[PDB]
Amino acid sequence: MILSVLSSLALVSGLMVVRAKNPVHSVLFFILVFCDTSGLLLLLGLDFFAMIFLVVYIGAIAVLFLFVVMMFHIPLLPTQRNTTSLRYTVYAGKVRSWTNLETLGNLLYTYYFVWFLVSSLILLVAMIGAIVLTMHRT
Amino acid sequence: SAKNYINLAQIHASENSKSFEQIEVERALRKKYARKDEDYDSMLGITRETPPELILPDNVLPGGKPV
């Protein structure tokens, strides 16, 4: 039941984002959408992404949007009588069990390392573009 | 007209008598400052003013346009 109420509140916040009356409240609900989304990811079992969503989305992107706004103004049926006791747990593999961070870093920088450098180039493009356009310096 | 051509002749006098070494500098400055760009100059924080050698005296203007 924790998933249902959280998803519903996220949906309501997302709906109110697009039909907001002023940009400030739009950004405020935009933050709550990511808060609920991070909570949902936390329920999913991915703690790392659930907190990157705070660090990036409502840590830097939301702050950026708020700064700009300030100025310039087949399913399985719910019957579960004989399924909560049919869980087979393979104990092998629980010993030396990695987290969501070690597993990701194992293959992000070593096997699929070209895409990582492509993302670096994307970041450099953003950094250069934000400067060429907006340097008045008068 | 008689009074105006008197001060008109001074620029021709100061132009026809220029030495070759002065002419090189004059042509380089004229080509360098042919066109301007407020965008890049403002971005760099600098303003490109016309050199004093490239300023005609106000008395030969169409009636006075110091700006």
Curated annotation (Swiss-Prot), chain A:
Keywords: Electron transport, Membrane, Mitochondrion, NAD, Respiratory chain, Translocase, Transmembrane, Transmembrane helix, Transport, Ubiquinone. GO terms for molecular function: NADH dehydrogenase (ubiquinone) activity. The chain crosses the membrane at residues 48-68, 114-134. GO terms for cellular component: mitochondrial membrane. It catalyses: a ubiquinone + NADH + 5 H(+)(in) = a ubiquinol + NAD(+) + 4 H(+)(out). It is a multi-pass membrane protein. Its main location: mitochondrion. It comes from the Eukaryota. Its EC number is 7.1.1.2. It is found in: Mitochondrion membrane. Coiled coil: none annotated. Complex I is composed of at least 49 different subunits. Belongs to the complex I subunit 6 family. A stretch of 270 kb of the mitochondrial genome is duplicated within the centromere of chromosome 2 resulting in the duplication of the gene. The expression of the duplicated gene (At2g07731) is not demonstrated. It is also probably not RNA edited and therefore differs in all the positions known to be edited. Core subunit of the mitochondrial membrane respiratory chain NADH dehydrogenase (Complex I) that is believed to belong to the minimal assembly required for catalysis. Complex I functions in the transfer of electrons from NADH to the respiratory chain. The immediate electron acceptor for the enzyme is believed to be ubiquinone. This is NADH-ubiquinone oxidoreductase chain 6. It comes from Arabidopsis thaliana (Mouse-ear cress). The chain holds residues 1 to 174 of 205 of the full protein.
Curated annotation (Swiss-Prot), chain B:
Substrate binds at residue 7. Constitutively expressed in roots and leaves, with higher levels in flowers, particularly in tapetal tissue of anthers, inflorescence (IM) and floral meristems (FM). Disruption phenotype: Reduced levels of complex I and supercomplex I + III(2) in mitochondrion. Reduced growth rates and respiration of suspension cell culture. It comes from the Eukaryota. It is found in: Mitochondrion membrane. Signal peptide: none annotated. Belongs to the gamma-class carbonic anhydrase family. Homotrimer. Component of the mitochondrial oxidoreductase respiratory chain complex I; element of the extra matrix-exposed domain, which is attached to the membrane arm of this complex. Interacts with GAMMACAL1 and GAMMACAL2. Enzyme involved in the catabolism of H(2)CO(3) but that does not mediates the reversible hydration of carbon dioxide. Mediates complex I assembly in mitochondria and respiration. Binds HCO(3)-. Required for male fertility during anther development and dehiscence to regulate the secondary thickenings of the endothecial cell wall, probably by modulating H(2)O(2)-dependent lignin polymerization. This is Gamma carbonic anhydrase 2, mitochondrial. The lineage of its organism: Eukaryota, Viridiplantae, Streptophyta, Embryophyta, Tracheophyta. The gene is GAMMACA2. The chain holds residues 203 to 269 of 278 of the full protein.
